Amino acid sequence: KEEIYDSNWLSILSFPEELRFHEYNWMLPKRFDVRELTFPAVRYKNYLCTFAWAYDFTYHLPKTETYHKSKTIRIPTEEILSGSYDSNFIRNAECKRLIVQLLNKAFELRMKDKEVQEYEMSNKTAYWLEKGKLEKDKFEKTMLVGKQKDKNWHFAISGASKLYPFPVLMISSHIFFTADGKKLIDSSSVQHSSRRRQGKNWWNNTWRTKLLAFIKYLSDDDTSFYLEMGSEEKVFVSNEPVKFKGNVSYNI
Amino acid sequence: KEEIYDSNWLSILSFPEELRFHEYNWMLPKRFDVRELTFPAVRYKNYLCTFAWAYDFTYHLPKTETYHKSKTIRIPTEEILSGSYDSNFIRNAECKRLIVQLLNKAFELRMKDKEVQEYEMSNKTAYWLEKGKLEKDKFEKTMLVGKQKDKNWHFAISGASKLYPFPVLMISSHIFFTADGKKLIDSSSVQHSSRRRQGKNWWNNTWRTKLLAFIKYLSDDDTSFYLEMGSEEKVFVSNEPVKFKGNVSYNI
Amino acid sequence: MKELIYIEEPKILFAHGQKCTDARDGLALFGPLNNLYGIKSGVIGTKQGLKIFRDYLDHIQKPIYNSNSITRPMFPGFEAVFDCKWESTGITFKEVTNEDIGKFLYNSSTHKRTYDLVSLFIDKIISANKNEDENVDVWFVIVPDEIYKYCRAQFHDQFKARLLKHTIPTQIFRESTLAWRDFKNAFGLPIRDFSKIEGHLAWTISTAAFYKAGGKPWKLSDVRNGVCYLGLVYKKVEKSKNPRNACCAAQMFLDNGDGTVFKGEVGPWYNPKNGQYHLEPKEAKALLSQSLQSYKEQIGEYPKEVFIHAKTRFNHQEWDAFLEVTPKETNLVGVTISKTKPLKLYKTEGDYTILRGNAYVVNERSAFLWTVGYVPKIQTALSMEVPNPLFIEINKGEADIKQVLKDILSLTKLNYNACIFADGEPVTLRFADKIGEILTASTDIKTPPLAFKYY
Amino acid sequence: MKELIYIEEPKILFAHGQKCTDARDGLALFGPLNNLYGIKSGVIGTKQGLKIFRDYLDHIQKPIYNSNSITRPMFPGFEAVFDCKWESTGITFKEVTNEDIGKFLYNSSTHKRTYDLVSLFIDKIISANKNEDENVDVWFVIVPDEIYKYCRAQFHDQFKARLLKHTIPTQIFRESTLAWRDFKNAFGLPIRDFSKIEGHLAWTISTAAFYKAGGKPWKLSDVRNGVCYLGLVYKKVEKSKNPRNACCAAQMFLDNGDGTVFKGEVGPWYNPKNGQYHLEPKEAKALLSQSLQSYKEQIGEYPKEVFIHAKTRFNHQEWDAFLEVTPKETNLVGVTISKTKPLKLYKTEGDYTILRGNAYVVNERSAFLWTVGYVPKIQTALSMEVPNPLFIEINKGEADIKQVLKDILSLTKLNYNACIFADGEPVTLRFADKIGEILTASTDIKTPPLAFKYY
DNA sequence: ACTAATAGATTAGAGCCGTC
RNA sequence: UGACGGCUCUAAUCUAUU
DNA sequence: ACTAATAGATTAGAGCCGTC
RNA sequence: UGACGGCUCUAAUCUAU
């Protein structure tokens, strides 16, 4: 008795080359926002961290064209992968914290790039689909959007990046609803109330298949997919979860 | 059915005509004492409660010859048993209290006149007979004083006048011990221990007969015994107990 | 020639309403008023002391033959009698060593050493009550002989006063009481020889151990409808503090539709300072109103008659207070119980003394009554020596004295601390005595449990 | 491709030296470790409070065979599975009319009406506990639907908090719960319909009520000797007292000879004032110096190794304080429990989710374990949908993660409060949460009781 | 100095349903 | 509070970067 | 002013004993 | 304090100089 064991994690089978720190001295004011940028980057002290080039940010920041590559700090990612970094300028915990900031930021930018509409939860952002991008309202013979009573339900995912076990994308799947597809019900209680009503009619296998189906459509190739944080370097994430080994099967 | 009962109470058949008050105003000595008087007289304020006349006490009190009969406040004995007499000088409850006070003093005087040795106590004073006064200490073919082991026990009686139900002599019986009948032992605990030793073989019949015998010995006449409350006036108290007619009975 | 009225023994109830004037026989033939399954008993004492208790809890289990059933009734057994189970199963123990007891026993200052010994037992009993997963119906304290032989205030009074704040029923046993066969007087037979009486000595212990934990053995059937009874004792406390202080305690004996247990409104009043045993009007209203008030929660209307039993004589300065806090249809009565009346009747024929239930009426206000002696029902003498009759005088109020004597026999019927034929002093007075003494041991009592099993 | 180590089910021990894996099916055949004879219950509520309780309880002694299941389709009678008799007989009832509770229902101020509602409920309990000769075991409070629908701080927390001073175990029900058929949703069937699960519904009431009164239904069997389990939860206090104040709760799993002691050390520590869940060094030593002594006074020695638990991971500041008050043979070790890693695992075939007990270890310090899932003994999922695996990692000190994972399983099995096959968290935290929940409701509790029956 | 900072990474409440 | 899940929704803290 | 006054009359304590 | 009788031995209070 043994069981093939797939998960809700998503391994990072290839991590970008190195962490590029920008010596953006006096280039950015305190009032600056970076969440509008199409590429994941956050400020640290007087520096800016990313994996792309300086001119990659000049499309929205034409002033930033004066930056030179001679003022860039390069830190290898696989060095942080082993958790072996030790420096007074920035701690390893800060390094790992910086990465998970970028990966979380990078995921939504690709998510907003994809034709999947979003929703604002208590602490994170989900991504629900709509009728209009599907065939016969199904994907890979799996019901990805359904119609129940006078409403319709939508599958959604909420992925966050974690680093303690290993570089992995950690997805959370949950259901969301609309009145006629275009507009959702704007009452949290009823939206939750219908979720349990329809959620309790589901089972393990159907929960897994819909989650895997969304990633497969999200996947760019059959074997894996690449997260387009930048147009040149990318974070590649397998479209198949981190499988495990279950050495005990069901007994009767 | 019919159960006769004899209590430890001796009713008084008769009282004298009156009680005499002597006003020793500005003529009694400051160190005046009434205990040494052979007649029962109690002094309080200026009055002297007694039953004898002034010339009776002149034998040791020549200064009382100046007393004159005008200040002899004679209160008839007929008022006590009903409480009719009510005066500011002497309260009705005080006449009863004065009467019982002097009778007990008259009682202890008569025991001293009899050849009976006393046993002083904090509250009372029982009276016990010494062996050899009468043959084998058996009055009216009834045991009165015995010798148990090296210890000898002598019957004793403590009596006090009580008037509330009716004027009655209300007496109690208890045992006393010595070494040879002449030396009192100072071991009160042993006295108590011996008292419990003597009581472990007595019952109702020997309890009443012993008490009944003792008062019979104290009798001055056949059916009563007087008290020397005056040179010519006495109170006669029945030497037989008051009889109780209990018409509800059970077998012995 | 004085006529002696006689009142018959008052009737008592038992399981399903039985007619048995005797209590021990009534409990032998018929069970208690309520069933209680088993009794979960905990034990605290010296390590070796437990063994003698383990000896006793089975001796009670088997029947013990006292004497002729006429003299002293046989004891069928706890399970047979009480319809309740009580054995070594469920016993919870708390070890108490001897070395600490000895070092406390070797102190010349009695006051703190007595406080220390009871504290040694208390810290065990308190923690076991709170921080334990075992339900204990009633605890039993086994005290070594040397404690009270050399170091005793009083241990028993101090023990119950402090345990009162936490409401656990406790019973105290001495080695001498239980291990009477073991402890022996080297120059003869054991001092505590009661083999002949052993039959009933188990019963009183068993009846106590029943009332300690949810015991409702019997209920008098002669209680008049819509009436209540109050006891009263004026205890004194000389334990340091002021040079003198007279206390007080009381209980109700009301009636309900069918049977009524009785509890004691104590609420002690240490206010009396002069030392004269009388109640000031300020507190007297509180006592009667609380007793009157507590009747309301049971029946809903004020009791039709309330009786004030007391050992002392009510002063006129006091009895005015009781009436003014009393409605105008519930006439009060005040009776006094006195043992200081040296009257003793005798029987000219027969070596034995007078019987019970026979009363002499001096007048409509006051009368005599006998409650102790040689009863013909069991033809044995409760008091080997001549008894002393109870003096009842209606000091205040007015009621038919025949009813009071008839009712006062009913109070004498029950004494749950000792299942006997009849108490020689009405229950409202003896139960007043212990509840007064217990609460005077300590002066740090705020609200005392109102029931009796805690005393 | 990462392997998952299977942890064999924690093994609980039963009476007679008998041993069964599952509890509620084991309790069906075999009974409790201790015999409690009967249960002298008490009931307080309205007139309908009895009728719902009397009808339910008088229906619960008979074997209510649960229908249409293989998980637990039976209940073999109350007294048969417990060897203790307790039924409608012995039900002591105090009446709370509808008018007085109604007058306290329509008050605008929620704080005072919640305090007044409990005040009237417990004042009957407190008076009945003290001022009644009949002994109760545990009370069963019944409140109607409109009470918490309108008045509800929390009534349940307030109720238990005020009774800790008197140590009277209770239980709270509602007309919706017991008489689920009485109140009917007019537009359908009863809202809380549980008829299919009614048979093993009665398992939960029949189990905790047993535990509230001296109950020892089942015992752990895989506990190694000399090991101490100190579950430390951090509970916050916000209402009517300062929000930035954190308290603590402490449990125990020591073994004295044979037997698992499960008393909960309370000694609440309000020292954290900064809103952070950490213990100052002043009272950090107070944890063990009180807990270790409780081991010492129970065993006569110090534990060779102590498993301390916490829902929140520790820091170096605490550990120096913890170990500095321990000798050099009682190596401390700090395990933290975390139900916040939303990992989810799936399987290829079957609508059923993953079985229970299969644990994944990340490294020598951290591991994942599934307390809930598709439990095979009942042939149905303990959690119907995919659960959250528990993230157990060792924080301070060193220990074997294999046994720590096993010991965590060896804690979820028992839950005296919940008659469930297995709990989703170790009870050294679950019952820690309840202690913190109740101890924080009232703010005048001193040296609170430790036994779990009072919660 | 602290200032609110924006995502981390931890933390407890608290309401809401289904289901055993 | 029968009791266990499950999410949803709020709230807070320490870490650095401003 | 009360100084103790010597008794009656009440009350409580603390000892000890028995157990027909 | 097993309990409940019976005495012992102290003591104080109130009612009157």
Side-chain angles (χ1 to χ4, degrees), chain A residues 3-9 164 166 170 196 199-200 202-205 208 242-245 247-250, chain D residues 1-4 6 341-355 358 363 366 384-385 393:
Chain A
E3 215 34 65
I4 169 65
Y5 223 96
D6 64 348
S7 85
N8 80 306
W9 263 354
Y164 164 72
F166 32 78
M170 162 155 188
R196 190 68 46 196
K200 284 307 178 183
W202 287 9
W203 302 118
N204 159 42
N205 269 358
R208 141 170 149 171
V242 179
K243 63 144 174 300
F244 291 122
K245 282 323 287 171
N247 80 337
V248 184
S249 312
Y250 99 105
Chain D
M1 81 305 288
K2 305 188 171 73
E3 50 286 10
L4 314 195
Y6 190 109
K341 293 286 154 297
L343 193 66
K344 279 175 188 313
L345 270 301
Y346 307 86
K347 270 157 57 166
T348 55
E349 73 271 352
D351 65 333
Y352 73 90
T353 88
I354 171 65
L355 273 45
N358 37 290
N363 39 0
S366 323
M384 144 174 148
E385 56 209 10
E393 88 156 355

Side-chain angles (χ1 to χ4, degrees), chain C residues 416-446:
Chain C
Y416 289 142
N417 202 347
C419 184
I420 43 187
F421 192 20
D423 199 299
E425 160 152 338
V427 54
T428 67
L429 279 303
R430 216 180 245 279
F431 276 7
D433 179 25
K434 39 191 64 161
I435 195 174
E437 188 90 65
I438 279 181
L439 262 49
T440 37
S442 167
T443 168
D444 197 16
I445 298 324
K446 184 33 62 183

Side-chain angles (χ1 to χ4, degrees), chain A residues 1-52:
Chain A
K1 35 106 172 182
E2 206 270 312
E3 215 34 65
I4 169 65
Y5 223 96
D6 64 348
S7 85
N8 80 306
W9 263 354
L10 267 206
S11 41
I12 306 192
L13 80 187
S14 84
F15 208 112
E17 179 44 70
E18 42 84 14
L19 269 67
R20 175 170 160 157
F21 257 121
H22 265 185
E23 277 149 57
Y24 258 50
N25 319 102
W26 64 262
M27 202 38 51
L28 77 154
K30 177 174 294 192
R31 332 294 149 200
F32 222 135
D33 173 0
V34 200
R35 297 158 285 288
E36 83 299 333
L37 180 57
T38 39
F39 319 107
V42 316
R43 72 200 77 202
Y44 173 88
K45 271 198 291 215
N46 38 57
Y47 302 116
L48 176 56
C49 84
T50 184
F51 316 132

Side-chain angles (χ1 to χ4, degrees), chain B residues 3 6 164 196 204 243, chain C residues 1 347 349 351 366 385:
Chain B
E3 259 300 329
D6 43 358
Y164 160 71
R196 290 286 146 201
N204 161 77
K243 221 69 59 64
Chain C
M1 25 65 58
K347 297 174 61 182
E349 71 288 356
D351 201 24
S366 51
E385 304 81 330

Side-chain angles (χ1 to χ4, degrees), chain C residues 57 62 169 304 373 380 418 429:
Chain C
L57 39 63
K62 294 177 179 179
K304 278 297 303 313
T380 63
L429 279 303

